[PDB]
């Protein structure tokens, strides 16, 4: 038998309860980071290594800019939830 919830992987652009920043001209932070890491390592890195790098890229390379002193200089950290039971590579 196999657990019915097994082998699922969720990659949220943000941890529970927070905002996800999106730039009208450049697109969202999460997607931007995800695409650049995948278009450069998608074929050679394990899914978890990839998303970990996306996590860092989003946590570092970004910082919001808005008027309201309340939404000024804000950060973001993606969240990965894994029920995988094997390593995942998109090749071979």
């Amino acid at each position: 038998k196999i657990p019915v919830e097994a082998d699922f992987l969720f990659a949220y652009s943000t941890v529970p309860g927070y905002y996800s920043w999106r730039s009208p001209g450049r697109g969202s932070w999460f997607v931007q980071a995800l695409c650049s890491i995948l278009e450069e390592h998608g074929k050679d890195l394990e899914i978890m290594q990839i998303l970990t790098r996306v996590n860092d890229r989003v946590a570092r390379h970004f910082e919001s800019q808005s008027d309201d002193p309340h939404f000024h200089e804000k950060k973001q950290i993606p969240c990965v939830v894994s029920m995988l039971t094997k390593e995942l590579y998109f090749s071979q």
């Binding site: 196999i2 997607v31 309340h70 390593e87």
Partner: protein
């Protein structure tokens, strides 16, 4: 062994739900730049080997039907499945053009007991949406 088996004809189907415009009743504004994401995403997953299709401004019933239908297909020759949701959202839920729908109800359709052809195969969901209203201030 220690890695999922990728030795199949197809890598898998990749559903990208790109919600940009919403109904007035929802009170949600246009998600500018979401088209930029959808296209970059389309190319990336396409390059990985996915058979991706992009559905725009979907209603909650539409998103529900899309996922349900996709779970009913035959993935016997597929290595895995992937779905990307781009929309407005709140903790545990995501917005259709006409309202909100539970994220679990979207992914539940793929439980082992409801999609035999994807059993023991990875099911991936990438979500770009909000999950609350708290802001991360950062430190140092």
């Amino acid at each position: 062994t220690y890695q999922y088996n990728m030795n199949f004809e197809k890598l898998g189907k990749c559903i990208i739900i790109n919600n940009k415009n919403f109904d007035k009743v929802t009170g949600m504004g246009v998600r500018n730049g979401t088209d930029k994401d959808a296209e970059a995403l389309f190319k990336c997953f396409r390059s990985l080997g996915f058979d991706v299709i992009v559905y725009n401004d979907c209603s909650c019933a539409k998103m529900q039907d899309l996922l349900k239908k996709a779970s009913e297909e035959d993935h016997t020759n597929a290595a895995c499945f992937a779905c990307i949701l781009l929309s407005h959202g709140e903790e545990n839920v995501i917005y259709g053009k006409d309202g909100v729908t539970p994220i679990k109800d979207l992914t539940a359709h793929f439980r082992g007991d409801r999609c035999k052809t994807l059993l023991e195969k990875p099911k991936l969901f990438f979500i770009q949406a909000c999950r609350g209203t708290e802001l991360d201030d950062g430190i140092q």
